[PDB]
DNA sequence: CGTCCAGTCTAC
DNA sequence: TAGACATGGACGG
């Protein structure tokens, strides 16, 4: 559920739906507590884009589609297990909680938001979440400036391994990326975030917040194969690696000294 | 076999 | 903040 996976899911949606025409209503599973999507069109296309840990999906009526209406945008958050799949209409995956159906005359497929653990959410409207920082993958320069010009914010009092999960400043970084990034630099997880980032402005911490997830995207791995990602990892859950619980109870994997603020 | 572990969101 | 939110598989005692 991290940046690279949201970004590959956007790629997948755009490639799978490039020729497809969808029709009818947007079908939510009965168990899902997310909002019904009030969009219905006789002929519409689906496109996507990702920003940090959010994915914007746009449902665009084709010319002359009925009823006459503007496009509708939704924003998804994947939680721990969210994903998109394109399947035959009659072979729906289990836990397909939101479904878009191709219209005739093509082979009848379904584009599904699949979410086993049901932690993901979707909203109506295209707005990104207002507090989130810029995307480490696609807004690198804005993201770098938003960290550095704000180092006096209380957020950077926390250990660097906890600050990397703060989506106001590291939108797209999650639990495996913070392990892999700190591991490249041999920076102890529980050194203070402000102290680590002041010692700055050999790629540095903020550069690696971009280049490391970019590597995952280049694998096509964690994609929307699973072994090429398992071999790419150097720290997260790897043998020989230490691990501690941060203050919110998430496991930080690291090697060597845990740092001064370790619990 | 029973336990444990695997990003926001909510409410006290 | 602390626990909730929730399914399934690996891992033990």
Residue numbers in the entry: 2 to 202, 222 to 244, 252 to 290
From the primary publication:
The active site hNEIL1 mutant, CΔ100 P2G hNEIL1 (K242), was used to investigate the structural basis of urea excision. The complex that was prepared from DNA in the first eluting HPLC peak afforded a crystal that diffracted at 2.3 Å resolution. The 2Fo-Fc electron density maps indicated the ring-opened deoxyribose configuration of the flipped nucleotide. The urea lesion remained covalently linked to the deoxyribose C1′ atom. The amino group of the flexible loop residue Lys242 was positioned at 3.1 and 3.6 Å from the amine and the imine of the urea moiety, respectively, suggesting the potential for H-bond formation. We surmise that H-bonded interactions involving Glu6, Gly2 and the urea lesion may prevent subsequent proton transfer steps necessary for base excision involving Lys242, resulting in the trapping of this pre-excision complex.
This change has been shown to modulate the rates of base excision on a range of substrates, with the unedited form being significantly more efficient in excising Tg lesions than the edited form. hNEIL1 also possesses apurinic/apyrimidinic (AP) lyase activity that catalyzes β-δ elimination, generating a single-nucleotide gap, with both 5′ and 3′ phosphates.
